[PDB]
Amino acid sequence: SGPVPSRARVYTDVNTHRPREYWDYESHVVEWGNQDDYQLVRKLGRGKYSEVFEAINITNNEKVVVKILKPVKKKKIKREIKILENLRGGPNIITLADIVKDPVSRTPALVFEHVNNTDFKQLYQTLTDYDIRFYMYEILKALDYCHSMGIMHRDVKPHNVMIDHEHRKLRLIDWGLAEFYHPGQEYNVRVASRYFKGPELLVDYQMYDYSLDMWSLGCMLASMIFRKEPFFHGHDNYDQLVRIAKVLGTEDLYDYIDKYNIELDPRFNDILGRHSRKRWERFVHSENQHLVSPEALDFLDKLLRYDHQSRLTAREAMEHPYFYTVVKDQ
Numbered sequence: 001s002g003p004v005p006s007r008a009r010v011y012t013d014v015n016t017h018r019p020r021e022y023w024d025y026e027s028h029v030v031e032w033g034n035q036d037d038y039q040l041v042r043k044l045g046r047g048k049y050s051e052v053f054e055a056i057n058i059t060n061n062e063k064v065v066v067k068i069l070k071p072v073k074k075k076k077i078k079r080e081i082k083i084l085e086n087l088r089g090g091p092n093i094i095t096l097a098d099i100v101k102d103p104v105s106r107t108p109a110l111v112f113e114h115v116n117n118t119d120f121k122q123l124y125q126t127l128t129d130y131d132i133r134f135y136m137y138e139i140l141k142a143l144d145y146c147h148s149m150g151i152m153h154r155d156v157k158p159h160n161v162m163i164d165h166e167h168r169k170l171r172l173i174d175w176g177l178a179e180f181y182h183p184g185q186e187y188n189v190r191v192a193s194r195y196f197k198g199p200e201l202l203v204d205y206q207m208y209d210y211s212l213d214m215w216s217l218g219c220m221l222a223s224m225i226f227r228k229e230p231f232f233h234g235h236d237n238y239d240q241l242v243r244i245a246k247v248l249g250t251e252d253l254y255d256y257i258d259k260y261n262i263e264l265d266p267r268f269n270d271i272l273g274r275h276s277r278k279r280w281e282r283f284v285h286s287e288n289q290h291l292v293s294p295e296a297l298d299f300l301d302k303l304l305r306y307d308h309q310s311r312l313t314a315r316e317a318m319e320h321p322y323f324y325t326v327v328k329d330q
């Protein structure tokens, strides 16, 4: 057999000890609420699998968000519902408030708590150094919680982090790509958005884990402190790896793939080239230098590693000196 196997270094056996029904989402029996409780007000967006609306709950008069599914890959339906139910109440995880049958589409409609957020292209230009540290800690709370519950998000991106800046409140949304981690399981590499895909995805390595989410958060951090959106700006999936290699170097890339006995797609032969690892100071200039510190760079350096096993875990990340200046609640 070809590729060397891999395991999460934390929360490894979390699912294997749980009752079968916790992770066996296929068997879950959906509890339906009352569709007439809700009234659609404004369409907020169309995803790949769904349509999203601001609504209002008529029974309590409170604002709500309704995601109406478009079932073509029907398995993801029971998977997402079970994941949000398992995670409900956790820190900075969006609350699934109800599940109703939509009379028009005839499909499930997830009803979430309302969060009033601002556009990230507008918001990621405003964040002071202090505020980057604050919100990063808040994200980590969300990620450690779901990782501890045996769940990987697999789509961390600025779009999926809803932020109420006036109230300094944060929520991690869109659990449509989320999955239960089972040691030794082979996963689909076709997940996450292009700029936020970890090296494991890009080299076709299927036995990945929670550490996928940490590469992603790494990409977000780099874009914030350096003011460069996105940080790794690929034309496509292949060039995306080339973009990573121009920063982290090709020798460490070859070391990664060699450790796991993986073969790069031969398409890379004529496009990858030879690149040294860059020092993080090369991305610093007079416009972003107020967002950068020794601690910020060390922290970043420990998130953005090729080897998914060498990345900081969420809990270790919360232990980093980067977070010392941040006041905790309470």
Ligand SMILES: Cc1cnc(Cl)c2c1[nH]c1ccc3cc(O)ccc3c12
Pocket: 044, 045, 046, 047, 052, 065, 067, 094, 112, 113, 114, 115, 116, 162, 173, 174, 175
């Ligand atoms: C594409 C997509 C998928 N899933 C969710 Cl929950 C959302 C989404 N877009 C939005 C936009 C605003 C939202 C506000 C919420 O309070 C909760 C979820 C969303 C969502």
